[PDB]
Design a protein around this ligand. Structure first.
Ligand code: DIE
Ligand code: DIE
Lengths: 168, 168, 168, 168
């Protein structure tokens, strides 16, 4: 590549893996969103919360792909595994599954930053710090806050309704 | 009729029956609306939800009558049977009765579409698809969502109040 | 399902398969878009054309999922197969691959409409006609027009540049 | 210096060298710009592209000098070597020379970031990441894209004209 400079094959490969993780997270949230739109679940604020996360994770993957090209790396796509569940249980179950998911993405970001640091690739390090690391910390904080309020509320049916109406 | 073309006596008669069904549905919802306005029931969001449905079903009947004339059919009116109940119980009872009602109207629409298909009357088929079939599916989806949230909420008095205040 | 009416298990299953086909088409176009953003390919109008198609096909899948829930069907997601190519060749190769893809989606839509017709499901028939069948015919017409102009232009390098600058 | 803190003599000296490299790059682009304004070359979009780069590299040097003073370092200026060529050949030759130049500046930035990291000078590391490293990666990506389109176009005279008219 005529433009490629200081960009290791190890980072290029890890960026392609992180793209797959973000697209898989987007797919998981798409499934979560539509589950809460079911007529027998019917929590529209929960549906909107997850649908908006599907969109954020998709945008995250496209920013990584744009960066891959900016550095002269080559995008390589793999299958997207279907989400781990077909039905997601209560808002509480779903928010616990969402935090598990986000912590895995954050750990993948931290591993990639560690690789870029070892490879002495400061553009990559800065890119992650600028667009991903702080967004994940803020999102995990918000989910943890939601989890705490959901738990304080669970008359489990009444608590689920009020959280969706008054917080989401 | 100088204008009548491809419009069978069977469809003309079924359209007149469907007009009666819609006017009867309007009347049912008028009764439901005023029941929830009773000082000893007093759920104003429920009253408004049903009153607005009375108006939609009346408009539905007038659109069918306009179509009957546009095709050269002849409107024939019958008695409107009084609604099946004088008192409608809880919001839950009422919303279950409303979904029963809407499913009967949807089944009458589907039967009429089947008749128009058999009679090779595409204007009729399109008319139903354009103005009625999707509106019924959306309305039944909304009622099913309401029923699910009402059920999750029923401290039955508190649940009824909160649904009327926070959803309707 | 309390709301489900006239919605066959065969249509429900075929809608879930069509969702997977649209998401796979979105993924293919995402790959096509980023290939044309490569520094050694560098045709930005081509990249934008495919990126915008990725977004349309994703929206198509979400409209199908919303309809599945509106009818009381249950969304079931499968793996998304990676796109069939890692590198897409010239604009001409890519536009030929895009038309192949769109014709497969159109054929899946026509098969689903045939199933809904056989199952006497007019809401489904109308839904496809309203949101999908005409959009596909218009898109295939546009791609065929692009293919004809690309072919008339291929001094193959000069022709590729001018098409991207003056048409896209 | 009353304000100097954690700022090593090695970084201070390297910043002064990087100022000289940026001013020399500005001078090179000034020469490139005016060459394309020659009546016997006459590619005004190329001239404007390089003139605007002369201005960016000059601004880059002034930002480094402002930072040198903010840290309590002392600016020391050296001769600016004249650009390496008096005539720059075709747009293609010139864009290849520009990418060579930018890669040398990027490598000097990466070396300075490595020095700041070794010296445990995070303000310097952040300063480079914030104002220089991403700008260079974006500029090198853009030049690589231009180089690819120039090459696809070279009827070498016609290709040069069309690139200047339709891209620049
Ligand atoms: C944002 C929803 C979504 C999920 C999974 C895969 C794709 C392909 C672009 C997608 O758009
Ligand atoms: C922006 C053009 C330019 C080139 C080289 C040197 C100087 C001195 C400021 C200059 O302004």
């Amino acid at each position: 590549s005529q433009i490629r400079q200081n960009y290791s094959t190890e980072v290029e490969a890890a960026v392609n893996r992180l793209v797959n993780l973000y697209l898989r997270a987007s797919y998981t949230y798409l499934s979560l969103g539509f589950y809460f739109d079911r007529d027998d679940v019917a929590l529209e604020g929960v549906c909107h919360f997850f649908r908006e996360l599907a969109e954020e994770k998709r945008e995250g993957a496209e920013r990584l792909l744009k960066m891959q090209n900016q550095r002269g790396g080559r995008a390589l796509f793999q299958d997207l595994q279907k989400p781990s569940q077909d039905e997601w249980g209560t808002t509480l179950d779903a928010m616990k599954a969402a935090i598990v998911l986000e912590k895995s993405l954050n750990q993948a970001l931290l591993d990639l930053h560690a690789l870029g640091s070892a490879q002495a690739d400061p553009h990559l390090c800065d890119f992650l710090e600028s667009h991903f690391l702080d967004e994940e910390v803020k999102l995990i904080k918000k989910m943890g806050d939601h989890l705490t309020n959901i738990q304080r509320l669970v008359q489990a049916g009444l608590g689920e309704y009020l959280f969706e109406r008054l917080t989401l």
